[PDB]
Design a protein around this ligand. Structure first.
Ligand SMILES: CCCCCCCCCCCCCCCCCC(=O)OC[C@H](CO[C@@H]1O[C@H](CO[C@H]2O[C@H](CO)[C@H](O)[C@H](O)[C@H]2O)[C@H](O)[C@H](O)[C@H]1O)OC(=O)CCCCCCCCCCCCCCCCC
Ligand code: CLA
Ligand code: CLA
Ligand code: CLA
Ligand code: CLA
Ligand code: CLA
Ligand SMILES: CCCCCCCCCCCCCCCC(=O)OC[C@H](COP(=O)(O)OC[C@@H](O)CO)OC(=O)CCCCCCCCCCCCCCC
Ligand SMILES: CCCCCCCCCCCCCCCC(=O)OC[C@H](COP(=O)(O)OC[C@@H](O)CO)OC(=O)CCCCCCCCCCCCCCC
Ligand SMILES: CC1=C(/C=C/C(C)=C/C=C/C(C)=C/C=C/C=C(C)/C=C/C=C(C)/C=C/C2=C(C)CCCC2(C)C)C(C)(C)CCC1
Ligand SMILES: CC1=C(/C=C/C(C)=C/C=C/C(C)=C/C=C/C=C(C)/C=C/C=C(C)/C=C/C2=C(C)CCCC2(C)C)C(C)(C)CCC1
Ligand SMILES: CCCCCCCS[C@@H]1O[C@H](CO)[C@@H](O)[C@H](O)[C@H]1O
Ligand SMILES: CCCCCCCS[C@@H]1O[C@H](CO)[C@@H](O)[C@H](O)[C@H]1O
Ligand SMILES: CCCCCCCS[C@@H]1O[C@H](CO)[C@@H](O)[C@H](O)[C@H]1O
Ligand SMILES: [Cl-]
Ligand SMILES: [Cl-]
Ligand SMILES: [Fe+2]
Ligand SMILES: [Mg+2]
Lengths: 37, 40, 31, 34, 63, 167, 505, 37, 80, 34, 342, 34
């Protein structure tokens, strides 16, 4: 139904998802492959 | 005779022909189905 | 001769600055 | 310094030929009426 | 305009400005020659490039 | 002397791998891009005020009250080149962007040099990728490193007496 | 008034003065050709086609005259090193004279067409307006182009009525002008097959005659005439420039990679012949064959032609020059005098060592010597304190086979090192560095210079094509857009089809 | 002969002269070192 | 406007998220598995951490022939 | 290869669920155009 | 009149969210594949067999170090088609051979052509002059000279830029060490066009924003503009006076100003392209002969020009063995040029 | 009222679909150890 889930919630959740995934990528810089260790 | 690279050439030639053929077929089809509306 | 040439071109550029600023085509308001 | 002997004439003409061309065009613009 | 002996002889060759064949005319035949020309250029490129290698065609100074 | 400064800077700080210099490049490459963009779009939409034989620049008169190009037409073009909401229709917003993009980028460039001044250097991924046994698997970062080493060992060839170049 | 960058636009509506300007341009170009040839003849030294050929002397037009059969001078020499030959009128000088006379006649014709610009021929018989029927003009010109192209191939290149063209062996040792039969099989499309060149001109010529006839007789489709604006001479400018940049890119490529039409005796070797050690391989093949047949090492190397050794030298690689390193290759390394012979390096244990050659990328290169298995055996150290491989430590010697130094062995470490430094360039030569006050710094050949100018011009002509294409298709808005242009045409949601008013919603 | 009607006056204003001279002089200041080499 | 439904309307609608609470995670998990199963290595020919070198080899398996390049890589991969 | 099926298994189950949730509105769109 | 061509033309030119046009038939597949190829390569594809490098996220590289690397030097200038005589239809081997490089370069090239055709097509339909297409000739001159002409003059594609952040950085440093590219006057004009362009962007934007007429009550001034307004939103007369008094000269003509904004960075990029065409043939501005003659004879003569050559010499010797692995360079420690201590 | 499948829909998905797939792939890579 076109308008039920408020756009500000979608933006906040989408944004948080981006931070989590990019955060995971940064964590990976320090562990496993590409970590220098 | 037909060297392996001449065969490769024909294959690349047919693949491009198929890519272009299908593309224009699909676009011609969609253009005929969804016509623009003009005043008489 | 090279030093003379380089200094000459530079001097000509500085002279050009002077004329471009003080002897410009004056901006005139019209429509 | 052992520079190329044609460097002087090349530089001089490079400056003079187009500079002169512009001066010719400018002056004959100014002398037109209006 | 000035007429000359040569101008009069050549007159017919410069008299059809703007003359066209109707509609699409020979465009379809033009397209086919263009298509064949494209394939031709592709062939000579790929030979020079050693992407298309043919018997008896040694792309080198040694042939 | 400018190029000398740049090469030695790269050797000692790996400036290319520093995000502030990368932002700087984005600022100047983008500033040039947007300059050409704005120039082309305004020029593309100049209103016809001149004949074929005269320069279109005589179509604008210094201090005229009317705008000299059609922004709606410029927007109609650029919005179709990409998509509608990617193009500006507000001139003030457009010009703010033109100011802000290169300025902010060059601020970061300035800050790159000003912070590498205190030896907080570009990213160092030298020997970052290692195989199962522990063999170093080189990346383009390590090839950058080889170039940097060449600059380092050669620069100021008579100036260094001790093994580390600490300033 | 007209801005400076538009002054020549006064010719757009003036066919007669356009022909005059074209005539003047043609006169300038032919005059340049004549001048250039005369300048080259005033400077060229014909005494040594082996070690001082045209391409070592900064000759640019000379190879183009030689390519098509002009090889001799009225003074008696020929580029192949012959004496007492009679070239007839069509010597280098005769070719230069013809271009100068042509230049003059074209200049006079330009003057006539400038003054008598108002010819009835240039006006449309129905409107009295200046008009050129470009579609038919194209057919006429294409037909003539076809005729000339066919005749060039069928008569000149074949030698049927003409001299033929420059051909040579795979190593550029025995080049000469020869009649060439057309190659009609698939090898005609091999860029190194000269028969392909002959076949091209015959076949493309015929196709040009046919298509020319077509274009004279059959009018353009209304739809193509309108789309390509065939009533506007600037459309022809746009498409011609396009064809020209295509052609410019092609001649740059074939000059750089080499082909039957860019022979190494005329333009110099290619960089790729150095990249693949093309001449070194052939030299080695010949030496091995001589040894297998029972010759001594001295006899084996002495049987290597001077000219072949000279190709195996980096100073003749066109990828070793500089943009502002001006003039002949002779101005850099010198006028080559003689091959010093083949340098063979040995350590104290008597094992043969090979100097690592300089790749084209490198303005400078270290001296490193390896055995036949590529293991480092000697070098010239930078830092000395931890040197292990110095010529002094390893007792490196150098012996020469063939050339000036045949039979000699050098043991003095600075002398041996001096020869090793030369060996990074390949085969070692003696040069006259005094005659031209040579500076010791590598310059490119006419192959390099030709390729540079043409790749640059080609790229710039792409902009020209784009510019004049834009001018042709957007002529109606050249002075600006419609002052009454409706917002509906440029806003969204009014027309179903962009810029078509009949499709309004 | 009758005049050629295609003839047109030509112009270069003062600003263009200044811009042109600047281009030329600056190009000369740049390329001159390479000419002297 | 050009006719298509506004993005804001779409991404705030229940039917969008009914569909995409499934399609989005599925694609993410598919990508994950492309790597976790090791299929990514074999599709593209990318060495695993244990397949860059043979145990005693310290020479890079560089391609040196144009037309026998494919066979060279095959030969290199046999030597693992 | 078995991993090809394991990797594309979530994808095909997602495409099917999307079709089931749009088929009444997809048939409606196609019939309107035809 | 209203045949299949005209019907197809109607559909291609529909006013939709993403305009298609005839140019879209070329643009969209080539652009999509170029971008897709890059993302694919940098995520999954190695450079082990062509360069001896890891180059993908899969191998452990990050955003800055991933690349789609050029093919091995032994590939020459092979088009390296999937069905060509090198890969022979094998997708895996094709990736291992650097087939994605020519894939991206070539689709990228036809993509840029499609984009510039798109610029022409849209301009014609909307009825504006095609200056945007014309300005885009500069990005085309750059892509073509650098990614195609440069490697074509060299031994192989190997020496073209690799499609990656750090790989491009490597390309810059290679050009410094081998070509002394900073000394090249065509590169210098490029720098002037880019930095001059960025200057013009900043100064024009700032000038407009600081000579605005008050056309609203808001302290945030953006809402006080209407696209359809006839009036200029800022004062050219005030802008002109400010600059005339600050800098000595100022624009007075708005059409000249905006054309000059096209001209500067467009011309600069064109000049840099010409320089790279020269470098394709090693036709460098590497040296000043007068400087070298003096320095060789006079061991006390030193300039910043001679200092920079020493750096180049270091770059070449230190980077070459790993950067050019097909050469099999072994430079024993003792031959490496080094100053004192370092 | 509004169409569901459009040119815009295709363009969006040609980018969106591989992007999410790729992100899952790169997410998984962060747990790989030598
Ligand atoms: C403008 C804007 C427009 C928009 C851009 C449009 C993009 C379209 C894409 C077109 C791509 C063209 C690919 C060209 C590939 C190529 O060239 O590939 C190169 C091949 C030649 O192959 C090379 O040849 C070399 C020399 O070999 C020769 O010499 C050797 C050593 O002696 C051996 O004898 C050997 O057998 C012999 O063949 C080496 O072998 C190399 O390894 C090999 O790659 O030529 C060839 O295919 C063809 C050569 C002639 C045609 C050239 C036309 C186009 C190129 C213009 C650029 C000029 C470059 C000069 C630099 C300045
Ligand atoms: C059987 C008869 C016959 C034979 C034996 C030949 C033989 C030949 N032809 Mg000819 N031809 C013929 C009939 C024949 N032709 C006919 C009937 C026509 C129609 C009129 C032509 C039209 C024609 C053309 C247009 C060309 C030839 C060329 C050639 C040569 C090919 C080898 C070469 O050097 O290519 C080198 C050229 C190529 C490999 C083509 C390059 C294609 C490029 C890549 C296209 C893209 C251009 C674009 C601007 C590039 C920008 C990007 C770049 C800068 C990176 C060879 C001499 C070529 C030539 O003149 O060589 C010197 C050539 O260009 N022919
Ligand atoms: C296709 C063009 C072309 C080519 C490839 C050659 C090639 C050659 N010539 Mg010939 N020549 C030509 C045309 C050409 N020539 C013309 C038109 C003339 C009349 C001027 C001559 C007269 C001539 C003479 C008298 C001599 C040669 C010589 C030579 C050789 C050395 C070249 C050299 O040192 O260049 C040097 C090249 C440069 C220094 C590069 C030029 C770069 C310019 C200045 C760039 C300009 C930049 C521009 C201003 C920027 C604009 C920016 C703006 C748009 C914003 C070489 C074989 C020499 C030879 O050895 O004779 C036996 C020799 O003595 N040539
Ligand atoms: C067959 C080739 C050709 C021909 C016949 C033309 C002809 C024309 N051009 Mg095009 N153009 C070309 C190629 C060509 N162009 C190329 C290769 C480029 C990119 C460099 C351009 C870019 C271009 C632009 C941007 C413009 C034109 C314009 C024009 C028109 C007026 C020209 C004028 O009055 O200049 C007058 C020129 C001078 C008074 C001096 C120019 C000095 C030059 C820059 C340096 C010296 C060059 C030297 C003498 C010649 C070297 C020869 C070279 C080929 C090796 C005219 C229709 C103009 C137009 O469209 O008007 C409406 C215009 O604005 N052209
Ligand atoms: C307009 C869009 C477009 C364009 C311009 C290109 C262009 C290119 N592609 Mg790309 N591609 C596309 C879309 C496109 N592609 C799409 C949609 C896909 C997904 C399937 C691909 C997937 C793809 C792959 C995997 C590869 C390419 C490759 C190439 C290159 C070589 C193509 C070739 O040699 O074909 C030659 C064919 C033609 C030029 C068409 C000929 C049509 C003529 C006019 C008609 C004659 C044909 C006739 C009917 C058939 C009879 C033959 C018979 C005798 C056997 C070139 C850069 C290769 C490359 O990048 O290698 C590095 C490569 O490996 N493409
Ligand atoms: C950036 C590139 C570019 C752009 C934007 C333009 C733009 C323009 N061109 Mg030019 N053109 C170009 C390059 C370009 N051209 C090249 C490289 C050539 C060959 C010399 C031409 C030849 C040309 C002619 C003869 C004419 C134009 C004209 C025009 C105008 C009308 C549109 C048109 O005809 O496009 C043409 C379409 C294209 C350039 C797209 C080509 C797509 C090809 C067919 C894909 C091929 C794929 C290939 C086979 C894959 C294999 C690769 C291989 C390496 C393996 C417009 C100003 C016309 C004009 O001036 O009208 C007034 C005109 O008459 N063009
Ligand atoms: C790096 C660039 C520097 C910008 C920095 C500024 C940061 C601010 C962010 C602005 C970014 C610009 C995006 C504007 C976005 C914006 O701010 O406007 C918001 C806008 C709102 O639209 P609506 O919700 O009204 O829905 C649109 C419909 O109503 C139209 O029918 O949504 C979009 O346009 C995003 C669509 C995503 C695009 C998906 C389509 C993909 C197709 C590919 C495009 C092809 C291009 C053609 C060339 C080949
Ligand atoms: C504000 C934080 C500083 C960031 C820089 C952006 C704004 C300042 C730079 C402008 C210099 C150009 C010359 C003046 C040009 C000029 O005169 O500007 C004029 C322009 C309009 O002026 P107004 O008077 O309408 O508004 C400003 C005040 O009066 C408040 O209404 O000012 C603004 O738009 C300020 C916007 C601030 C809103 C926050 C922006 C934050 C940007 C985010 C950056 C993130 C970086 C990401 C990198 C990875
Ligand atoms: C009239 C006459 C005559 C005569 C003639 C003559 C004597 C001639 C001539 C001529 C000539 C004698 C000529 C010429 C020429 C030349 C030229 C035309 C040139 C040019 C040049 C240029 C253009 C350049 C450029 C450049 C430069 C400077 C530098 C670098 C770059 C370039 C390359 C760009 C006679 C008796 C027969 C008879 C009848 C009449
Ligand atoms: C190659 C190839 C192909 C194709 C393909 C493709 C088409 C692909 C694709 C693809 C794709 C299409 C992909 C994707 C992707 C992606 C991604 C991976 C992403 C991402 C991201 C990110 C991570 C983000 C981030 C960020 C940014 C950028 C900004 C700011 C912030 C942030 C941080 C958020 C084919 C089969 C034909 C064939 C052969 C080859
Ligand atoms: C304007 C000067 C004219 C001088 C003409 C001298 C003709 S000389 C004549 O030239 C022929 C070339 O076709 C040669 O075949 C022939 O051997 C030679 O004697
Ligand atoms: C208009 C003045 C031109 C006069 C020059 C014509 C030279 S004519 C030329 O002379 C050569 C050497 O004697 C002969 O070898 C050759 O057969 C002959 O054609
Ligand atoms: C996609 C390639 C474009 C080539 C255009 C050639 C059009 S061809 C043209 O098409 C008309 C309808 O469109 C027909 O009425 C006519 O019979 C046919 O000759
Ligand atoms: Cl230093
Ligand atoms: Cl110290
Ligand atoms: Fe503006
Ligand atoms: Mg990790």
């Amino acid at each position: 139904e076109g308008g039920r889930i408020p756009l500000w919630i979608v933006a906040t959740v989408a944004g948080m998802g981006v931070i989590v995934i990019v955060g995971l990528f940064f964590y990976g810089a320090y562990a496993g492959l590409g970590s220098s260790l | 005779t037909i060297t392996p690279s001449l065969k490769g050439f024909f294959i690349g030639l047919l693949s491009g022909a198929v890519v272009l053929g299908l593309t224009f077929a699909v676009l011609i089809a969609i253009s005929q189905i969804d016509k623009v509306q003009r005043s008489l | 001769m090279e030093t003379i040439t380089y200094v000459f071109i530079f001097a000509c550029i500085i002279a050009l600055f002077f004329f471009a600023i003080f002897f410009r085509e004056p901006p005139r308001i019209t429509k | 310094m052992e520079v190329n002997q044609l460097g002087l004439i090349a530089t001089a003409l490079f400056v003079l030929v187009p500079s002169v061309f512009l001066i010719i065009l400018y002056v004959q613009t100014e002398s037109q009426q209006k | 305009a000035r007429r000359t002996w040569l101008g009069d002889i050549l007159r017919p060759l410069n008299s059809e400005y703007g003359k066209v064949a109707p509609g699409w005319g020979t465009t379809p035949l033009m397209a086919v020659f263009m298509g064949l020309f494209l394939v031709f250029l592709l062939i000579i490129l790929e030979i020079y490039n050693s992407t298309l290698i043919l018997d008896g065609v040694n792309v080198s100074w040694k042939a | 002397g400018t190029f000398n400064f740049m090469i030695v800077f790269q050797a000692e700080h790996n400036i290319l791998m520093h995000p502030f210099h990368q932002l700087g490049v984005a600022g100047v490459f983008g500033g040039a891009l947007f300059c050409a963009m704005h120039g082309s779009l305004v020029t593309s939409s100049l209103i016809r005020e001149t004949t074929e034989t005269e320069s279109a620049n005589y179509g604008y008169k210094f201090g005229q009250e009317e705008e000299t190009y059609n922004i709606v037409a410029a927007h109609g073009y650029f919005g179709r080149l990409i998509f509608q909401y990617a193009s500006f229709n507000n001139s003030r917003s457009l010009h703010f962007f033109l100011a802000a993009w290169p300025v902010v980028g060059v601020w970061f460039a300035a800050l790159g040099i000003s912070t590498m001044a205190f030896n907080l250097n570009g990213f160092n991924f030298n020997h970052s990728v290692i195989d199962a046994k522990g063999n170093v698997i080189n990346t383009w970062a390590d090839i950058i490193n080889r170039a940097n080493l060449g600059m380092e060992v050669m620069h100021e060839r008579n100036a260094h007496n001790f093994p580390l170049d600490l300033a | 008034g007209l801005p400076w960058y538009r002054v020549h636009t006064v010719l757009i509506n003036d066919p007669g003065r356009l022909i005059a300007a074209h005539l003047m341009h043609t006169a300038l170009v032919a005059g340049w050709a004549g001048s250039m040839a005369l300048y080259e003849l005033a400077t060229f030294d014909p005494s040594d086609p082996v070690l001082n050929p045209m391409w070592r002397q900064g000759m640019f037009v000379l190879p183009f005259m030689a390519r098509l059969g002009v090889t001799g001078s009225w003074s008696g020499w020929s580029i192949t090193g012959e004496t007492g030959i009679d070239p007839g009128f069509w010597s280098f000088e005769g070719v230069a004279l013809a271009h100068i006379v042509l230049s003059g006649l074209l200049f006079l014709a330009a003057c006539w067409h400038w003054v008598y610009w108002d010819l009835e021929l240039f006006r449309d018989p129905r409107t009295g307006e200046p008009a050129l029927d470009l579609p038919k003009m194209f057919g006429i010109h294409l037909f003539l182009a076809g005729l000339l192209c066919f005749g060039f191939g069928a008569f000149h290149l074949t030698g049927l009525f003409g001299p033929g063209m420059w051909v040579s062996d795979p190593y550029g040792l025995t080049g000469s002008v020869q009649p060439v039969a057309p190659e009609w099989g698939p090898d005609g499309f091999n860029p190194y097959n000269p028969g392909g060149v002959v076949a091209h001109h015959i076949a493309a010529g015929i196709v040009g005659i046919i298509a020319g006839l077509f274009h004279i007789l059959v009018r353009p489709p209304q739809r193509l005439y309108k789309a390509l604006r065939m009533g506007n001479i600037e459309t022809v400018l746009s498409s011609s420039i396009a064809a020209v940049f295509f052609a410019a890119f092609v001649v740059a490529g074939t000059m750089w990679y080499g082909s039957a039409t860019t022979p190494i005796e005329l333009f110099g070797p290619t960089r790729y012949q150095w990249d693949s050690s093309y001449f070194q391989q052939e030299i080695n093949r010949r030496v091995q064959a001589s040894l297998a047949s029972g010759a001594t090492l001295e006899e084996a190397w002495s049987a290597i032609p001077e000219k072949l050794a000279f190709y195996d030298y980096i100073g003749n690689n066109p990828a070793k020059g500089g943009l502002f390193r001006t003039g002949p290759m002779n101005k850099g390394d010198g006028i080559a005098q003689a091959w010093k012979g083949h340098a063979v390096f040995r350590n104290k244990e008597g094992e043969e060592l090979f100097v690592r050659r300089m790749p084209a990328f490198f303005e400078s290169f270290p001296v490193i010597l390896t055995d036949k298995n590529g293991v480092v055996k000697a070098d010239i150290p930078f830092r000395r304190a931890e040197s292990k491989y110095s010529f002094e430590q390893q007792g490196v010697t150098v012996s020469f086979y063939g050339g000036e130094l045949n039979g000699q062995t050098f043991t003095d470490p600075p002398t041996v090192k001096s020869y090793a430094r030369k060996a990074i360039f390949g085969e070692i030569f003696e040069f006259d560095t005094e005659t031209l006050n040579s500076d010791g710094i590598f310059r490119t050949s006419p192959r390099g210079w030709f390729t540079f100018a043409h790749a640059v011009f080609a790229l710039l002509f792409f902009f020209g094509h784009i510019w004049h294409g834009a001018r042709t298709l957007f002529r109606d808005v050249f002075s600006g857009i419609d002052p009454e242009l409706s917002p509906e045409q440029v806003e969204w949601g009014f027309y179903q089809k962009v810029g078509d008013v009949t499709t309004r919603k | 002969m009758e005049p050629n009607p295609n003839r047109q006056p030509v112009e270069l204003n003062r600003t263009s002269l200044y811009l042109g001279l600047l281009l030329i002089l600056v190009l000369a200041l740049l390329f001159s070192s390479y000419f002297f080499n | 406007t050009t006719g298509e439904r506004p993005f804001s309307d779409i991404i705030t609608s229940v039917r969008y998220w009914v569909i995409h609470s499934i399609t989005i995670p599925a694609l993410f998990i598919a990508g994950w598995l492309f790597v976790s199963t090791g299929l990514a290595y074999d599709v593209f020919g990318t060495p695993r951490p244990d397949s860059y070198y043979a145990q005693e080899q310290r020479s890079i398996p560089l391609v040196t022939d144009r037309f026998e390049a494919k066979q060279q890589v095959e030969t290199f991969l046999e030597q693992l | 290869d078995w991993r090809v099926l394991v990797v594309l298994l979530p994808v095909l189950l997602a495409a099917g669920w999307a079709v089931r949730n749009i088929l009444p509105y997809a048939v409606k769109q196609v019939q309107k155009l035809l | 009149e209203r045949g299949w061509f005209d019907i197809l033309d109607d559909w291609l030119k529909r006013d939709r969210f993403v305009f298609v046009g005839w140019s879209g038939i070329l643009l969209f597949p080539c652009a999509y594949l170029a971008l897709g190829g890059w993302l694919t390569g940098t995520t999954f594809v190695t450079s082990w067999y062509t360069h001896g490098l890891a180059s993908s996220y899969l191998e452990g590289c990050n955003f800055l170090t991933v690349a789609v690397s050029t093919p091995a030097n032994s590939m020459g200038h092979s088009l390296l088609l999937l069905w060509g005589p090198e890969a022979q239809g094998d997708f895996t081997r094709w990736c291992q051979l650097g087939g994605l490089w020519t894939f991206i370069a070539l689709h990228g090239a036809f993509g840029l052509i499609g984009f510039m055709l798109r610029q022409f097509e849209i301009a014609r339909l909307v009825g504006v002059r095609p200056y945007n297409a014309i300005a885009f000739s500069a990005p085309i001159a750059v892509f073509v000279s650098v990614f195609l002409i440069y490697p074509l003059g060299q031994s192989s594609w190997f020496f073209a830029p690799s499609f990656g952040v750090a790989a491009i950085f490597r390309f810059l440093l290679f050009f410094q060490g081998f070509h002394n590219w900073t000394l090249n006057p065509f590169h210098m004009m490029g720098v002037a066009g880019v930095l001059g362009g960025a200057l013009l962007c900043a100064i024009h934007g700032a000038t407009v924003e600081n000579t605005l007429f008050q056309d609203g009550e808001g302290a945030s001034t953006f809402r006080a503009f209407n696209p359809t307004q006839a009036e200029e939103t800022y004062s050219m007369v005030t802008a002109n006076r400010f600059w005339s008094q600050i800098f000595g000269i100022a624009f007075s003509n708005k059409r000249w100003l905006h054309f000059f904004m096209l001209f500067v960075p467009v011309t600069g990029l064109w000049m840099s392209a010409i320089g790279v065409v020269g470098l394709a043939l090693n036709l460098r501005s590497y040296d000043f002969i007068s400087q070298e003659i003096r320095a060789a004879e006079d061991p006390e003569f030193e300039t910043f020009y001679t200092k920079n050559l020493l750096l180049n010499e270091g770059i070449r010797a230190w980077m070459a063995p790993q950067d050019q692995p097909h050469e099999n360079f072994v430079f024993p420690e003792e031959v490496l040029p080094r100053g004192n201590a370092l | 009222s509004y169409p569901i499948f459009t040119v815009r829909w295709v363009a969006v998905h040609t980018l969106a679909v591989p992007t999410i797939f790729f992100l899952g792939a790169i997410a998984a890579m962060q747990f790989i150890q030598r």
